[PDB]
């Protein structure tokens, strides 16, 4: 009774360049599609903390450290692109070959982000929802990249990999693990 999340492996992260990928949602509903840091805990839902930059799935808003309304909501069976320019640290969202604007009439979706240890693509699927994730290993399967993205000098993510990229998700089966010593609430004392 929760929400799943999906990401690539930690090795595929980027520090520079100019990257782009697509996402074709099957049904409308509850999605979260964006980018994320590597050190991402799976407990919190996506975009709540300061560890991810992500879009809505239902009502058309951007999600990082809270919320702010942004762009047009979902029809069923559409493509939500995701863009990032490391040369000036900006996050750009497209939708069906159209850039989503803000309430203040700004072109970017996020601005002046710190690089840190870089980013890697991310997604999230709510209860009952479904949507597949093209990523760029076949250039022929790029729907709106020639419309927006190719002329700006962007690159698809898996531009030349001889095999498709590994992915990791969060599973719900609770395991056991030692207590972190920098925990908020509890502690232990081995006197």
């Amino acid at each position: 009774d929760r929400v799943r999340i999906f990401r690539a492996e930690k090795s595929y992260t980027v520090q520079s360049g100019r990257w782009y990928f697509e996402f074709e949602a099957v049904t409308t509903g509850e999605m979260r599609v964006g980018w994320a840091r590597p050190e991402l805990r799976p407990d919190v839902e996506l975009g709540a903390d300061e560890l991810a930059y992500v879009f809505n799935g239902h009502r058309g808003q951007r999600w990082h450290l809270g919320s702010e309304p942004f762009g047009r909501p979902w029809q069923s069976g559409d493509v939500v692109g995701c863009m990032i320019d490391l040369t000036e640290n900006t996050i750009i969202f497209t939708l069906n070959g159209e850039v989503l604007m803000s309430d203040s009439g700004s072109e970017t979706a996020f601005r002046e982000i710190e690089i840190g240890d870089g980013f890697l693509p991310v997604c999230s699927l709510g209860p009952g929802q479904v949507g597949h994730l093209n990523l760029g290993q076949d250039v022929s399967s790029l729907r709106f990249f020639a419309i927006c993205g190719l002329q700006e000098g962007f690159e698809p993510f898996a531009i030349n990999m001889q095999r498709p990229v590994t992915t990791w998700f969060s599973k719900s089966l609770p395991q056991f693990e030692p207590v972190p010593p920098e925990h908020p609430h509890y502690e232990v004392a081995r006197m």
């Binding site: 056991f176 693990e177 030692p178 207590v179 081995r190």
Partner: peptide, 10 residues
């Protein structure tokens, strides 16, 4: 004896 492999899980 409480050797340092003995920890408490969560």
């Amino acid at each position: 004896q409480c050797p340092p492999r003995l920890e408490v899980q969560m």
